[PDB]
Structures are given as structure tokens and as C-alpha cells.
Amino acid sequence: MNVSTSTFQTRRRRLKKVEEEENAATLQLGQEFQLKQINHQGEEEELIALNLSEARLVIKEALVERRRAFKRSQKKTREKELESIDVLLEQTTGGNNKDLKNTMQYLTNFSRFRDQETVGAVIQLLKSTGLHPFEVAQLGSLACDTADEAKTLIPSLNNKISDDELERILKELSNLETLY
Amino acid sequence: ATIWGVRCRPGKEKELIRKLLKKKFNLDRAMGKKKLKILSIFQRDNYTGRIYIEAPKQSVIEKFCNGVPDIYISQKLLIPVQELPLLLKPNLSEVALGKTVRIRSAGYKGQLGIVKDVNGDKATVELHSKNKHITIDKHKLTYYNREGGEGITYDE
């Protein structure tokens, strides 16, 4: 259709007809959304996922150093943050691209953690649990109260964790929720 | 069971069976007590290019089909007994263009020619004595009527 974005896994797709594994939330991901992934220098690594709070923080950073790049190129509570991030995007992008604006609005009316230190603590804790990046991103993203409830939201997570430990991580996350 | 299928040219199964059968009455009238061993002859509209004759021996069929044009007697096959009930089952289915002109200060002076194409400010003319096209301004050339005679400049 248009100029697309290439891929690094040198796929063996030599005339094999449409045989992609069915798109599902039971770890039956696509051919390119696999646990293993090739880095920029050519080393195999585990997929890295992140929560909504991470999404807001990394987007905020990326915007920031983009502004600092624009600047050196030219050399030679719940409302103030919204307004600052809005004017940040407006001065960054031309304005025609409304998709980034919509994503801004969604991520800024929905996310649990506002602090980088809380974010790092949660990432370390999810590392200690050692579950799938998709799983831990979902757990840090959605709100849960009870073990059976969380099993219902993620039926794939049947034989992956004990009920006691799921309750433990859940109450720990509940304490780590910030009150805006 | 001795029913043999024979190739022949398509579109004339009707006429070939007609010629065979008329010939057969002629023969049977001609001969005496001994009369030739051909039992039946037929064909199908669906299966063109072929006839089917039931007779006991190859030389009898050959002797019978001598004198018949267009029949390919050289291709015959003995139809196996099993294929016959199915075969015989009853139910199957500007004013300066193109004008004569002379040049009057150039190396080609006195050359008649014919205007072919004009590109603006300059006209192309084919020399009437030589095989060449030459480009030269029209205001500087003299135009004549179809026939030789009175001459006028570029003012028509």
C-alpha cells in the first residue's frame, strides 16, 4: 500500500500459505510478537513490556529530549499537568496528527502510578515475580481485587501462579496505588 | 458379442450410415444364396466422428467397406462386452502551409519548394531541385498561386 516498516527476523515465509497461529490472549501470539527478539547489535533478548504509567513516563521523556533537540537545532493537580503536556504536544507536533492527542487524553485520565520511584519499585517487583511481560503489563494496567476475579480476566493464567502469591502481589499493588 | 467401433470424419455419421445401408440393400439384392455377414450398423449423435458395426470378422467388414469414401476403416476397435449395455442404454443425456515558395537571399537562391510544417517565425520547405528540408523565415519568402505566374510576398 505505502512505504511500510521492515522487519528484522529473516522470516522463512517461502510460499507457505496463511498459517499464522490464531490471534488469541492464550500466549498464541503472532509470528513477530514472540518472547525472543533480536536487538540492534544482533543479540537475542526477552521481550520487554510496560504499564500505562511507564507509557506516560516514556512518552513524557521522549517528548522532552525531542524538545531539547529542536532547541539545540535552533540555537545554531490533574489540570496543570494536563495543560503543560497539552502545550508540550502542541509546540512539538504541527497539530494535524490528532491520534497522539487522543492517546494523550486517554493515558492522562487513566493511569495508576504518577511517580518514577513507585514505577521502578513495581518493575522490580514484577521482575521478582518473573511472569510474562504481557501478563505483568496487564496486571499493572488493569485494576483487580481478588484471585478468582483476576483468573477470570486472564483465563490463560490458570497454571502460572499460586492464589496466595497472586493475592500478595495484588494487595502490594493496591498499597502502591497513588491517590493522585 | 462382436461390435466394433470405427473412426470416420465427424458430421457425416448420418450420411455414411446411409451410404453403407443403401449399398447393403444393393448387395443383398445382387447376391444369391450366400449373403454377407453384417448384422447391424449404427451411430450416435452425442458420439461424433465414429460408427459402430456388429459383424463377425475383420475381413468381412473390410470387404464391406471397400468402395465407401471417407470412412477410416484403418482405425477399428473391438468394443469389450462390458461397455456395450452402457453404450446402448436408451437414456443418454495558416495560409502558408502546403504552398509553393521561392528563396531569394540564401545559398539556395532560386530554389522552389513546398511548405510542409511551420514552427512559428520560421517555415520548413523541401527543395524542389534537391532532397532536403530547410528552415527559413516566411516574411523573407515569396508565395505563388498553385500555377506558375504572378508572384506575391507574404501578404496573402
Binding site: 500500500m1 512505504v3 510460499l15 | 452425442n46 458420439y47 452402457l86 453404450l87
Partner: protein, 491 residues
């Protein structure tokens, strides 16, 4: 063609080979061809469902393909498909089908041998597919029976069940276009039975043989769904304005489709099993002459005029074929030929060019601020003088011809445009003697405009070209790009 497209610009770097599957043909075809009539019926050219169906591609200048809506200049042609009522062998793979059949069991679809046999393991060990296939064929020719059990390596007396049926194998032979098995119970093997065994052959069974499951599976060897080429593969000829002749390939497709219609109707109606046989033989003959018109020991198919029909091997094999004739070498624009003359007053690296050839050929140069004044002078001079131009290419691609444009003074040149200026002095141009028997017989010279009608070349150069001035002819090829003038100059 010549238009903007938003897809990435790309160069190919491999060519995979294989066979079409019938399902692939059915899925890739745009239309089904069922009516033998090509066109002219009821004075309509769009014969829907027949040969030269518009969905297969534009037949003439209409700006309407019904598939891509891009016209003949851009349409790459789209195939139809015709599903034969019975399968028919491929001419190119008659020997291959015989080879596989004698390699494999004709009832259970298994190789006559297995890795239990030492010679078989050695044959399979060969990495290269062709020699491997040859080894298995040479080994399985000797075997003429399916052993349900084979002696074991640990104990010769002990017999291990290899599997498969116990039917004795037949001797296969080639009679005309069909295969005949002698078991003797001599009988022609039905192509349907052959295709049955070929599908029943297992994945490992042909992976060991020179075949790939994904690319060329052995049942794909047999035609079940003939793909009908698009109109550009079979363009029609015009004897006169009213008399139009369909291409040889189109005629053969029409004949095949008539044969298929007759065969399927005869299947639907009563099947005497010998009328079916003769119809199948005629269909196979028609396919075979359509795709290969040089079968040894067989009458050759004649056209209406009594001459051989120009088939696929006929068009792809000879020196005038598609590879040797139309791809290895092929006709060229921006080139001239004429008689050569000797001119000792010309430099070694320099060749005189006739003025007429100079005014004919052009080299397109892009506009720059360095040569804007020069190109303005040339566009003012026009095609009609030697220093000038014949066309100007605008940025949008709209090309204006100066002969047909009267406003040449008004046309103002802009950067990024391209002017097809004529070849001037000192332009590198390749110069070729026709029996080009060696490298030095093709070299680039510097153009010298000279009014006369022969290629004047300095006369020490006649030795590499092996040229006289006794009527010999030589070619001049004008490079069309600065890249190419550069490589011509320094190589």
C-alpha cells in the same frame, strides 16, 4: 508503466521455482474461462466468461480492464483458469511422472525401498537432489515387487515389517502420450489413478526425492486447472482493417476448451468408457501440442493453414526465442547503424558522426544553473538545427515536443526538467562492429559532428574491430545517462 506508485521501490534478489497447485490457480485467477468463443459474437468485444475476457486484461485501447482500471500500458495481465473434467499429464514431466511411478508403489503410494536397505541409505545420503533422484531411480528399477517385510541388520533370518501392500509392481512404458503398465496384464494407467497415488505419497516420501512439500509437491505435476494467460501473452494480429486473426496460443486455448466442454458433457451423459477414453486422449493431445509442439514419434499439430502451431517450447527454445532472442540480447533505442569510412585527420579516441544521425539521436540532460543558458539556446534552436533539442521533460512527466510546439521562445526552462538535447561534440558514445568477437570490438569514442552520411573513424582503430571500408557497417549507441557516459569514459 510510467506513473507514481506508493509501494516501495525494489530490486529482486532471488527466483524460486516450483509448480502451481490447483487451489493456487483457482485462488489467483480472476475469471473462469468456459466459452470457447473469443469475441465478435453479437458485435460485442467483451465476451464475458470466454477467451479474452476483459477481466483477464484489456484487449485494446479502452482505459477499462474491469480488474485494475489502468489500461493496457500499465496492466500486467491477469490469468483465467479452466478446470479440466479429468486430470491430464504435463508434457515436460512425462519422464518425471514415469520416474516417480517406477520409484514408488502404485497401490499404497510408498517407495519400493526404505532406509532398511544399505544401497538405499547410500543413495539418500547424496545431498544434491538430481543425483539423489537418479540413485533412487536406478535402485528401484531393479525392484519389481513390494516386500511387506525385509531382513533385519541384526539378524538376516529375522524379518522386520516395512509396511505397505504386497502387490507386485508393473513395468511402466511410454506409448505416445500415455503410460502403459505391464503386470502380462498390460493396461494403460489412468491419469486419475496416477494422481491418486501421487496425493497418497507421504511428505517424507517425496522430500527424500527431489521434491519440496511447500514448492513443488508431486501431485501438482499433473494438470487439473490449466491457467489461461492474459491477452498480452496472446495478442491478436490484423491482416487488414476488417480481417483479424487470433493468436496461435488463443487458438490452442479455444481448441482445448472445446475438448474440455465435449469431455465434461460426455461425462455428464452416458460414459461408454471408450468414448471417455478417446475424449481424454484428445484433450491430452490438445494440451500437449498447446504446451509442446515437438513430441518425438507423433504427428505434429497443424493450424488452419497447414503450418506448425507456435507453441510454448517453440517460443522459448530457439535463438529467436524469449530467452536467447528477446532477453539475452534485444533491440535498442537511441542507436544508429551506417557504413564506415576512414579519416586519418581524426583523433584516436574520436569518431565522426553524420549530421542526420546527430539530429536524430538525443541524450537527455537535466537542467542545472551551470548550463541553463546553454540549454536555453538549444531549446531556442529546436530540433531543426544540430545544436538543439527534440523533447523537454517537465517535472510532472508531461513531455513537450518542440517540433509540434510553436511557443518554443515562450517556454522557459526550469531546474529539474530534462532536455533531450542532440549529441554534440565530445559526447562519449559506444561504437560497435557487428561480429563482436572480442572485447576491443566495442569501445566508446568522442562524437564529432560532420556533414556527410558515413561514420568516420580514425583508421588505426580498424584493427580491433577487424574492419575494412568495403561496405562494412557499424553501430553507435548513445548513453542516456550521466552515469553511463561516465562509465563509458573511464572503462
Amino acid at each position: 508503466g510510467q506513473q507514481y506508485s506508493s509501494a516501495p521501490l525494489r530490486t529482486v534478489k532471488e527466483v524460486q521455482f516450483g509448480l502451481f497447485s490447483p487451489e493456487e490457480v483457482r485462488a489467483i485467477s480472476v475469471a473462469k474461462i468456459r466459452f470457447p468463443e473469443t469475441m465478435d459474437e453479437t458485435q460485442t468485444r467483451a465476451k464475458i466468461g470466454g477467451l479474452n475476457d476483459p477481466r483477464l486484461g484489456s484487449i485494446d485501447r479502452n482505459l477499462k480492464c474491469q480488474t485494475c482500471q489502468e489500461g493496457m500500458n500499465e496492466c500486467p495481465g491477469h490469468f483465467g483458469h479452466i478446470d479440466l473434467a479429468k486430470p491430464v499429464f504435463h508434457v515436460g514431466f512425462i519422464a518425471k511422472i514415469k520416474k516417480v511411478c517406477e520409484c514408488v508403489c502404485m497401490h499404497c503410494g510408498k517407495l519400493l525401498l526404505d532406509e532398511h536397505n544399505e544401497l538405499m541409505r547410500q543413495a539418500l545420503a547424496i545431498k544434491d537432489s538430481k543425483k539423489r533422484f537418479a540413485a533412487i531411480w536406478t535402485l528401484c528399477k531393479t525392484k519389481m515387487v513390494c516386500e511387506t517385510d525385509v531382513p533385519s541388520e541384526d539378524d538376516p533370518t529375522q524379518l522386520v515389517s516395512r509396511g505397505g501392500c504386497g502387490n507386485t509392481q508393473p513395468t511402466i512404458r511410454k506409448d505416445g502420450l500415455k503410460l502403459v503398465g505391464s503386470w502380462p496384464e498390460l493396461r494403460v494407467l489412468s491419469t486419475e489413478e496416477i494422481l491418486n497415488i501421487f496425493k497418497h505419497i507421504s511428505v517424507k516420501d517425496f522430500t527424500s526425492l527431489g521434491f519440496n512439500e511447500v514448492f513443488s509437491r508431486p501431485e501438482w505435476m499433473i494438470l487439473t486447472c490449466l491457467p489461461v494467460p492474459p491477452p498480452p501473452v496472446r495478442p491478436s494480429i490484423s491482416f487488414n482493417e476488417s480481417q483479424r486473426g487470433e493468436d496461435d496460443l488463443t487458438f490452442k486455448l479455444a481448441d482445448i476448451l472445446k475438448a474440455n466442454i465435449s469431455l465434461e458433457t460426455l461425462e455428464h451423459n452416458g460414459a461408454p468408457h471408450h468414448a471417455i477414453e478417446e475424449a481424454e486422449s484428445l484433450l491430452q493431445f490438445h494440451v500437449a501440442t498447446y504446451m509442446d509442439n515437438d513430441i518425438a514419434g507423433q504427428p505434429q499439430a497443424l493450424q488452419k493453414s497447414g503450418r506448425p502451431v507456435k507453441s510454448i517450447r517453440a517460443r522459448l527454445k530457439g535463438k529467436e526465442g524469449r530467452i536467447r532472442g528477446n532477453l539475452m540480447g534485444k533491440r535498442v533505442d537511441f542507436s544508429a547503424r551506417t557504413v564506415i569510412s576512414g579519416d586519418p585527420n581524426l583523433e584516436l579516441d574520436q569518431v565522426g558522426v553524420p549530421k542526420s544521425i546527430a539530429k536524430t539521436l538525443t541524450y537527455p540532460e537535466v537542467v542545472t544553473p551551470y548550463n541553463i543558458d546553454r540549454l536555453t539556446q538549444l531549446v531556442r534552436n529546436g530540433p531543426n538545427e544540430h545544436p538543439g533539442a527534440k523533447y523537454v521533460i517537465r517535472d510532472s512527466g508531461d513531455r513537450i515536443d518542440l517540433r509540434y510546439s510553436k511557443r518554443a521562445g515562450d517556454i522557459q526552462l526550469q531546474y529539474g526538467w530534462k532536455v533531450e538535447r542532440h549529441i554534440m561534440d565530445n559526447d562519449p558514445v559506444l561504437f560497435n562492429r557487428q561480429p563482436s568477437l572480442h572485447k576491443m570490438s566495442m569501445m566508446a569514442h568522442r562524437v564529432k559532428v560532420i556533414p556527410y552520411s558515413t561514420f568516420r573513424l580514425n583508421l588505426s582503430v580498424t584493427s580491433p574491430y577487424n574492419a575494412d571500408f568495403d561496405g562494412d557497417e557499424m553501430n553507435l549507441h548513445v548513453p542516456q545517462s550521466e552515469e553511463t557516459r561516465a562509465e563509458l569514459s573511464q572503462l
